[PDB]
Amino acid sequence: GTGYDLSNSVFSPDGRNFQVEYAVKAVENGTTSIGIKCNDGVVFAVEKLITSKLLVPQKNVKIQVVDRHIGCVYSGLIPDGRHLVNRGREEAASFKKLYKTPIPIPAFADRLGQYVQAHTLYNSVRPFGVSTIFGGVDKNGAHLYMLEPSGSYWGYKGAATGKGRQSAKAELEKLVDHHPEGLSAREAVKQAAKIIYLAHEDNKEKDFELEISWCSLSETNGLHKFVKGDLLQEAIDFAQKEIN
Amino acid sequence: FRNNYDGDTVTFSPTGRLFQVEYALEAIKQGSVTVGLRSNTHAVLVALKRNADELSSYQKKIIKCDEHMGLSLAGLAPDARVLSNYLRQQCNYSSLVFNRKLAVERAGHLLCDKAQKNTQSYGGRPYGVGLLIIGYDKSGAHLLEFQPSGNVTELYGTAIGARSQGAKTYLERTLDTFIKIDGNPDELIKAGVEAISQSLRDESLTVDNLSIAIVGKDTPFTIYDGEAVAKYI
Amino acid sequence: TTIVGVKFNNGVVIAADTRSTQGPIVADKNCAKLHRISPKIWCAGAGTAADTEAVTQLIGSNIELHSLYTSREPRVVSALQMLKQHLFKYQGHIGAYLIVAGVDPTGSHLFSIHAHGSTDVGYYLSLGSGSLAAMAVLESHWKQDLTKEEAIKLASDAIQAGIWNDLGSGSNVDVCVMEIGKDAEYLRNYLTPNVREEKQKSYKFPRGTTAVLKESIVNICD
Amino acid sequence: GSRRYDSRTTIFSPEGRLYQVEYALESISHAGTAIGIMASDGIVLAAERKVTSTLLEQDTSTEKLYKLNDKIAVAVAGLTADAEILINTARIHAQNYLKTYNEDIPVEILVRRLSDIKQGYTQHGGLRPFGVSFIYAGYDDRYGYQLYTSNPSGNYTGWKAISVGANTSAAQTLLQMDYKDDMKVDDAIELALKTLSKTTDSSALTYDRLEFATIRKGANDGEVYQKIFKPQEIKDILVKTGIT
Amino acid sequence: AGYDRHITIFSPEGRLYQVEYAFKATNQTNINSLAVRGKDCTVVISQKKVPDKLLDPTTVSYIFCISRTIGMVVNGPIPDARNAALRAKAEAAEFRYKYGYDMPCDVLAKRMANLSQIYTQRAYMRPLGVILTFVSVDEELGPSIYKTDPAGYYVGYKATATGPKQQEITTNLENHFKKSKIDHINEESWEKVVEFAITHMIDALGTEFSKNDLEVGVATKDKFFTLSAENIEERLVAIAEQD
Amino acid sequence: MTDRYSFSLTTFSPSGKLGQIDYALTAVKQGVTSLGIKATNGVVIATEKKSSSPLAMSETLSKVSLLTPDIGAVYSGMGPDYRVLVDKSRKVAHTSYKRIYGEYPPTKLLVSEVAKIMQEATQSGGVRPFGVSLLIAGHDEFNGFSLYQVDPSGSYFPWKATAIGKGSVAAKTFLEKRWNDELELEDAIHIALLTLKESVEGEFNGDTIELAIIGDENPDLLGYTGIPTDKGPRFRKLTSQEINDRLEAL
Amino acid sequence: TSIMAVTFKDGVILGADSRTTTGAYIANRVTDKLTRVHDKIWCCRSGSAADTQAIADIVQYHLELYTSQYGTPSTETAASVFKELCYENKDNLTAGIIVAGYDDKNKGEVYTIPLGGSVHKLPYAIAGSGSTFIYGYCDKNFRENMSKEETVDFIKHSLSQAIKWDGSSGGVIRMVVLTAAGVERLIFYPDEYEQL
Amino acid sequence: SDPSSINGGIVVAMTGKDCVAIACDLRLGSQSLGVSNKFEKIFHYGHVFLGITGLATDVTTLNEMFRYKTNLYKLKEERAIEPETFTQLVSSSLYERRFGPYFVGPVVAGINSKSGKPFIAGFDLIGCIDEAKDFIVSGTASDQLFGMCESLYEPNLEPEDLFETISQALLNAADRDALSGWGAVVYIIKKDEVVKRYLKMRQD
Ligand SMILES: CC(C)C[C@H](NC(=O)[C@H](Cc1ccccc1)NC(=O)c1cnccn1)B(O)O
Numbered sequence A: 001g002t003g004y005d006l007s008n009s010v011f012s013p014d015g016r017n018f019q020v021e022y023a024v025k026a027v028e029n030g031t032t033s034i035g036i037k038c039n040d041g042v043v044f045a046v047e048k049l050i051t052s053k054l055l056v057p058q059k060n061v062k063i064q065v066v067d068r069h070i071g072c073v074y075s076g077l078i079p080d081g082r083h084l085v086n087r088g089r090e091e092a093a094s095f096k097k098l099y100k101t102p103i104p105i106p107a108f109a110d111r112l113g114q115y116v117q118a119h120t121l122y123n124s125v126r127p128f129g130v131s132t133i134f135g136g137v138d139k140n141g142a143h144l145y146m147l148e149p150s151g152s153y154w155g156y157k158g159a160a161t162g163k164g165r166q167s168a169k170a171e172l173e174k175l176v177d178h179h180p181e182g183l184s185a186r187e188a189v190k191q192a193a194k195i196i197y198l199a200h201e202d203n204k205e206k207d208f209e210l211e212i213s214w215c216s217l218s219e220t221n222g223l224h225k226f227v228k229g230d231l232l233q234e235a236i237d238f239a240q241k242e243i244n
Numbered sequence B: 001f002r003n004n005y006d007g008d009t010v011t012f013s014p015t016g017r018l019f020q021v022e023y024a025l026e027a028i029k030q031g032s033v034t035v036g037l038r039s040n041t042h043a044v045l046v047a048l049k050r051n052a053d054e055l056s057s058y059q060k061k062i063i064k065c066d067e068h069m070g071l072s073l074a075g076l077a078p079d080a081r082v083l084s085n086y087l088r089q090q091c092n093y094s095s096l097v098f099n100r101k102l103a104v105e106r107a108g109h110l111l112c113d114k115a116q117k118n119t120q121s122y123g124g125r126p127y128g129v130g131l132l133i134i135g136y137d138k139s140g141a142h143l144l145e146f147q148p149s150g151n152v153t154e155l156y157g158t159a160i161g162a163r164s165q166g167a168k169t170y171l172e173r174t175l176d177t178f179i180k181i182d183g184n185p186d187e188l189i190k191a192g193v194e195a196i197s198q199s200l201r202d203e204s205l206t207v208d209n210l211s212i213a214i215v216g217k218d219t220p221f222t223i224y225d226g227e228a229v230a231k232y233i
Numbered sequence C: 001t002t003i004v005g006v007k008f009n010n011g012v013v014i015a016a017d018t019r020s021t022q023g024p025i026v027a028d029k030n031c032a033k034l035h036r037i038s039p040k041i042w043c044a045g046a047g048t049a050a051d052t053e054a055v056t057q058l059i060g061s062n063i064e065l066h067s068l069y070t071s072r073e074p075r076v077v078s079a080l081q082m083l084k085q086h087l088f089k090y091q092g093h094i095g096a097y098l099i100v101a102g103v104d105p106t107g108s109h110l111f112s113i114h115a116h117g118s119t120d121v122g123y124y125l126s127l128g129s130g131s132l133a134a135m136a137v138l139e140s141h142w143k144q145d146l147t148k149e150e151a152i153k154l155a156s157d158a159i160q161a162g163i164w165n166d167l168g169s170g171s172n173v174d175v176c177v178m179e180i181g182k183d184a185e186y187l188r189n190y191l192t193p194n195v196r197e198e199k200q201k202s203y204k205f206p207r208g209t210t211a212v213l214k215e216s217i218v219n220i221c222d
Numbered sequence D: 001g002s003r004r005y006d007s008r009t010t011i012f013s014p015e016g017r018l019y020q021v022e023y024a025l026e027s028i029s030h031a032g033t034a035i036g037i038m039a040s041d042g043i044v045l046a047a048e049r050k051v052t053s054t055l056l057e058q059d060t061s062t063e064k065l066y067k068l069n070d071k072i073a074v075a076v077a078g079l080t081a082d083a084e085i086l087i088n089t090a091r092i093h094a095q096n097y098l099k100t101y102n103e104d105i106p107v108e109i110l111v112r113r114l115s116d117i118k119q120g121y122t123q124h125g126g127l128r129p130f131g132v133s134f135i136y137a138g139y140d141d142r143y144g145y146q147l148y149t150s151n152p153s154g155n156y157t158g159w160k161a162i163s164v165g166a167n168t169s170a171a172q173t174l175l176q177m178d179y180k181d182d183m184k185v186d187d188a189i190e191l192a193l194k195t196l197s198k199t200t201d202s203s204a205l206t207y208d209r210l211e212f213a214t215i216r217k218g219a220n221d222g223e224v225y226q227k228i229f230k231p232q233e234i235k236d237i238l239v240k241t242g243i244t
Numbered sequence E: 001a002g003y004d005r006h007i008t009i010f011s012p013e014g015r016l017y018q019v020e021y022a023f024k025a026t027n028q029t030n031i032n033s034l035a036v037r038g039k040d041c042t043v044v045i046s047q048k049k050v051p052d053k054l055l056d057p058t059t060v061s062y063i064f065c066i067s068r069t070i071g072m073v074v075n076g077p078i079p080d081a082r083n084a085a086l087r088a089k090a091e092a093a094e095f096r097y098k099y100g101y102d103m104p105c106d107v108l109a110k111r112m113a114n115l116s117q118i119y120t121q122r123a124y125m126r127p128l129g130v131i132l133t134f135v136s137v138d139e140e141l142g143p144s145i146y147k148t149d150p151a152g153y154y155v156g157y158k159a160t161a162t163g164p165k166q167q168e169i170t171t172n173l174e175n176h177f178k179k180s181k182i183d184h185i186n187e188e189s190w191e192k193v194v195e196f197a198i199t200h201m202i203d204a205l206g207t208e209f210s211k212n213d214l215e216v217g218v219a220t221k222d223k224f225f226t227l228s229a230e231n232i233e234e235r236l237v238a239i240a241e242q243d
Numbered sequence F: 001m002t003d004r005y006s007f008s009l010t011t012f013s014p015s016g017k018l019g020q021i022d023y024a025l026t027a028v029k030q031g032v033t034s035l036g037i038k039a040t041n042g043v044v045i046a047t048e049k050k051s052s053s054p055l056a057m058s059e060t061l062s063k064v065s066l067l068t069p070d071i072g073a074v075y076s077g078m079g080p081d082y083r084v085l086v087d088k089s090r091k092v093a094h095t096s097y098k099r100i101y102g103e104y105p106p107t108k109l110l111v112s113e114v115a116k117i118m119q120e121a122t123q124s125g126g127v128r129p130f131g132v133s134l135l136i137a138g139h140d141e142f143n144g145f146s147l148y149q150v151d152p153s154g155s156y157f158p159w160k161a162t163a164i165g166k167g168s169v170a171a172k173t174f175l176e177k178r179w180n181d182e183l184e185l186e187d188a189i190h191i192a193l194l195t196l197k198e199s200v201e202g203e204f205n206g207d208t209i210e211l212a213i214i215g216d217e218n219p220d221l222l223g224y225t226g227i228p229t230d231k232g233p234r235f236r237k238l239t240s241q242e243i244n245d246r247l248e249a250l
Numbered sequence G: 001t002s003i004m005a006v007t008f009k010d011g012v013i014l015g016a017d018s019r020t021t022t023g024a025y026i027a028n029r030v031t032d033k034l035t036r037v038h039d040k041i042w043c044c045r046s047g048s049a050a051d052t053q054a055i056a057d058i059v060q061y062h063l064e065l066y067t068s069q070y071g072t073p074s075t076e077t078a079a080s081v082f083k084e085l086c087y088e089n090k091d092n093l094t095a096g097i098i099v100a101g102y103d104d105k106n107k108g109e110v111y112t113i114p115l116g117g118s119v120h121k122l123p124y125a126i127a128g129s130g131s132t133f134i135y136g137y138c139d140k141n142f143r144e145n146m147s148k149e150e151t152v153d154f155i156k157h158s159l160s161q162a163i164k165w166d167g168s169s170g171g172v173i174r175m176v177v178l179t180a181a182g183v184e185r186l187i188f189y190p191d192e193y194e195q196l
Numbered sequence H: 001s002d003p004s005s006i007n008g009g010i011v012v013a014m015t016g017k018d019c020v021a022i023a024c025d026l027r028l029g030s031q032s033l034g035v036s037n038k039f040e041k042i043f044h045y046g047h048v049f050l051g052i053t054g055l056a057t058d059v060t061t062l063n064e065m066f067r068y069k070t071n072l073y074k075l076k077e078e079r080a081i082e083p084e085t086f087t088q089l090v091s092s093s094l095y096e097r098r099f100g101p102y103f104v105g106p107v108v109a110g111i112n113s114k115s116g117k118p119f120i121a122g123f124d125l126i127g128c129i130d131e132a133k134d135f136i137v138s139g140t141a142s143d144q145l146f147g148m149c150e151s152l153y154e155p156n157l158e159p160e161d162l163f164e165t166i167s168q169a170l171l172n173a174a175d176r177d178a179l180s181g182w183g184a185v186v187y188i189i190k191k192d193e194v195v196k197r198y199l200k201m202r203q204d
């Protein structure tokens, strides 16, 4: 029969969970966001669609910090992302409380993973309507991750999600090939700005706003910080020039 | 299609839509129009109040949350009572525990997170109301738009409710003028009443028909109704 | 009470006296202080009698269920862990003081457990009010590499120290021998050096001595 | 969510009947007939064992007749497992009463309680009812010998003679015809066996297909005796009544 | 009527479709794995497929270190796999605390099969679309392989294989054991037993492997560990000096 | 989260059937044949080890389980369902009986407990009935030797002999011809082996066949000596070798 | 009880006496107060035998679970788990615990957890009833970056003095050596240490 | 203060030749004040006899509890509970209240209906079983009873002799206890019959 796609924890005859697959659709419908891992850190960037002149610029911050050393960005249902980050923050506090050290990024990845997977186990809950790009610096270097509505996650050299994920993935793949020796923090920021400008064409009708954050061993000491003023404007220019 | 996926908030449609949330959004559109706008010194709410009969009262649209914060509503009024009340408590908790006036931005995030919980769990329902939140905090004047989906946006100006698109285009046009209307409350309200009148159709905005609210630099959030709004008609 | 435990080259032996007391009064001249947790894990108990019987049977039961669940012989360290965690939970209020011993698939074992939940490992141990009499003997005659027979002697002598010198202990000696390759042998009343001498007189009364007021047959059937 | 799969066991039909009670009653109607007859000097319980085999150990068997008290017993028609759940609580209730008042529980009090437990499964908790009908046979010092009946609805009534299970209507008609108030136990025994013998859906009514019990004031005591008939005893009494 | 295919209640045929569809999900990842027993070791081999160039190959794994002595390979989607991994770790740590010895491979297997059985009976829980192969050198049973499915079934194996191409490997291995007549691989070192497993993975699948196509787990007395890309290469070099 | 299936999943249909119980019994019908036979001085339970791979070690999967030293079980239907029922049966024998009278429960009462656990799966919220039928055989001082069948509904009945699963109807018939009330235990083991050969397709040896008895006390199986009143379990699983010995006099 | 842990050039050493007492009775004279909570993280136990064991068992459990998910825990993490238990249950515990561990990145580390459940990271630490008597000796004789042989001698002399004066201390001196090399068990009998 | 010394009361049991005997006094007091001289402390479930000394309210409660449990037992087991088994049921029932115990000293007497073997046992208030081959004593005159029994007793007494013995043991122990006496009752239990006799004794 049918109806296999009306309830969350239900396996279809081919072993799929359609409700999760439907969540992915909401993700694909979202703004494009990305992460680039560099030689000693990680860079996150995202497209903010300017719906109106009335949206105060620089105000509606999308990138989110967890603990002091982890950045999170997501595409899809924005509230769903905040919910996940709220949990991540609890998840990290609990770890730090018992173990004293700040949570390793792989450890934190699984925390989010297990939680997201939990929301595919019961028909009394709905799967998460976001894919999340997150990472930071720990005891053994930089880590970048992307997590899907199924709870699937892996480590990434570079990652993208949302409307322009294909442009971005193509742009990311080139960097991997033209720089096998490892990008640097400053370069990955300029590059980040470029990649968002290039996935913006898949939505070129509405203006947009750029947001970048980074966590680098040498540049931010390991701490997640936002990219502001001069370094943001310099990144904007590099992208604005490489669009022509 | 749609009929099979709109039973509750726990169900995704094949295109990734959540229809119960979209249906909640429809209660906003059916609500009476309300406007919000701010300078760097003040923030203003203007609301068109609706009556049932000419023998009925006009139902209140503006609620105060703290001395520095308040909101206007469009949609299910009880839902606004529940949400303003929660906000009142959060405003209150910040003062008692931290001796700190709650950041309007932070109130934004709290309302988002509270609405969200009702969009992912069984037996719950989305909230059926839109809210416009103005306040004056440690970083100045603020205006927020709350949608029952959980989406909260900071703006210079906006409007929600029936025929709200009128005022929204007016504010979008006026932007550069009103953002500067600092240290003059009566002129910011005038711009707000002019914004709200761009969404009139049915009738004119009368004395017991208008509701205005103001907060800023040295002005605690205060509600104006009736005779007290006369000088703006 | 005097309970001891003594390791030998190929196993472990435990023993106990058979006296129970309330205040100065001997309640039981022949109770059994040796308990079976499983066929090859046995336990000597001192303290509150109900408590050692209960804690021993509870963990025995649960050890049995574990064995069935895992298709394995029970290990002494399992009984040790479960008993200590139980006693710890009851802060001491369960007055069980135990010498736990046995053989299992990791070899032979000897441990002690105190009421508050602390455990000790040794080649020779004693607990109870007779603890010092018996330990004095053990500290005097124990050596490493005892034969099974030397161990039974050493253990049995330790309890005798308790029986003769401690008013808290008396009557008989019970032993249990657990050898690595063999079935555990429980040896109820291994020594009975306290047989009451024949009484001087018989107190059997001429029938009718006792005055009766009234009599009736009791219904047992239904 | 779950609501989808809820059969809603406790709603009314448009005609104001309880679906699950009615269907339970329908299940009861296929069960081996049980007969209860009260006389002046005692009570009789008889029941047809539904489905039998050469290999079924009858000496160790019990499926229809259960002792609740030293003075109360029941005959079962329906699901044996469901009945045992109810029988066990009934034994407890009897003992609770005995401990409280130091008197054996009056027959009705016990019956009302069991009937109340059944009624509850009809009004709340969304569970299926017990697929059981009981005939209660008992003695107490207020009413003497009593015969009661309860069904999945939690309704109960008192009878001079009654049947439950299969072919009740035919059996009720037969009992109505031959029953007389001045009956003795021995006459009641004969009536019960005639009635079952005339309503079996089997070829013939043999001992191995019956359970039999009597509650007698056995006059030589001046106290009441529950006799659960052993297989040989049924074979004897089946000959006396003239069925062989 | 038609809901007998959505939650785990019986169909008129006495079947549980949701369990059957969970078995289907196990193959979603298109990865094959096999396990063999040595004289005093146990080896698991599993294919490693990294399609996307953007991935960090070092984070792509279906092998888990459950405890100091137990390893587990999973055939099925990663999020369910990790769910099962987390549980097994927790269950293994707790067993050691409560009972004072290391949880045996087979006992953990039984425990996970029991949890899986529960999802088979209770409506509110879905089965996990995974198959779990547990391996160790048990201090009592020696080299050990125990495997559990979404039906809550589990058993011990001389050797086993799991995935879309399960049968190819199975028959291959079945043939060896008819030939060798014994119930393990006669080899003293884990290095040669790893080699045997890779060799028979190559014959049965008819495919050659580079150092980045495989993933190996080895269980010895008191450790279970996984081989590095370079440890694999060393194994791949050694087999080539013979073919 | 939270089990919100607080309603029955087994309900009555208009004809009065309990659907899930029927469907469970259907699952039992597909299961490998098992059987029990009661002799004068013992009981035998037997079944076929239907291995799922020649790579599997069939000893690591016992179908005949010990419940108490004098009680054993076997089943037909869903293996995992059986396994958890064994865990529960073993536990309830302790919690509801041993921990209260210091002895193991008589067969009928332990059966009665198992049956209750199965009845509950028929009525409670959010569960399905167990997809198994059990045969429980045991001994106790006051009731002697006794065989019981327990069905998914929770009903149980005492048997002289019976079979469940795949070839039950044929096997039940074969037992009706061969059974008498004077059977010695060895005779019953013989009948059991004959009856099971009709059900087994492939190889029929001590590796394929799983057979257990409830007979005399086994002091050699006790593990300790010194308590006269502990005279050893009456439950004994026969070895591969013990089976093959009786298959030559077949 | 006399217990100590000392960081040196190559790692860290743990030392203890072997006496447990009930009043003036020696309930155990060969006690092992040096307890392993991970391959290269150990602790010294003082106070209640029951309390410290129950605490140590809980910690070992946590660290085993930590290792399964995250990999070798730092000595600092081990100390944190100990602390959390000792602090949160300060009203029902009598546990004086020294945590010492070897790590490749921090060499040897020592954390002391006294009664209230506070944590203190030190080059070396002494505790137990017997420790009072060697505060002077240890303060005067400890140097950083000593050799293994030097460190064995420092602990040996220190504990023998503590054993000498404290009735609650005695038996054998046990040590555990924690370095990159490995874990080494040392034992010193009365006939050797008494005459130092 | 001491719940075991408020109401007062003694129970004693002995084994003989193919028989057992159990006896109690009849007093129920409230400190110095005698309240009732008809307070029997022996009860029986089928052929199993139980005497309880101690706090009267707990004596009554425990009787009602064992009646309840033995009734249920008999319904399920379809046989009368045996002395060995009942002893276990008493023990586990008392230990169940370990930290809020019943203030009682129970005593079990009976002959196993299957084996003919005479059986007695005694318990502490928290369920510890003392299973003597010779005699069990309980109550506020237990010291006196131990003295009487340890001298008067000899093995394998005939029912008529055992009667004389146990009666003297009780009577003379009671007369040295302010809180025991006021009448006395003795049960002589044989396989087949049980005889019950009220003794004549001092009423002070
Ligand atoms: C453990 C038992 C079997 C052995 C000895 N214990 C006893 O005799 C203890 C001594 C004691 C302990 C705590 C409180 C009051 C009395 N006596 C009893 O347990 C006891 C049991 N039943 C009746 C009367 N006394 B012992 O360890 O000296």
Ligand SMILES: CC(C)C[C@H](NC(=O)[C@H](Cc1ccccc1)NC(=O)c1cnccn1)B(O)O
Binding pocket: C114, C118, G001, G002, G019, G020, G021, G022, G027, G031, G033, G045, G046, G047, G048, G049, G050, G052, G128, G129, G168, G169
């Ligand atoms: C850590 C333990 C094993 C060692 C010593 N503790 C004991 O001997 C303690 C008493 C004590 C003495 C002096 C100072 C503090 C506490 N004794 C026990 O814990 C004890 C004694 N007997 C049986 C069970 N536990 B100690 O720290 O002096």
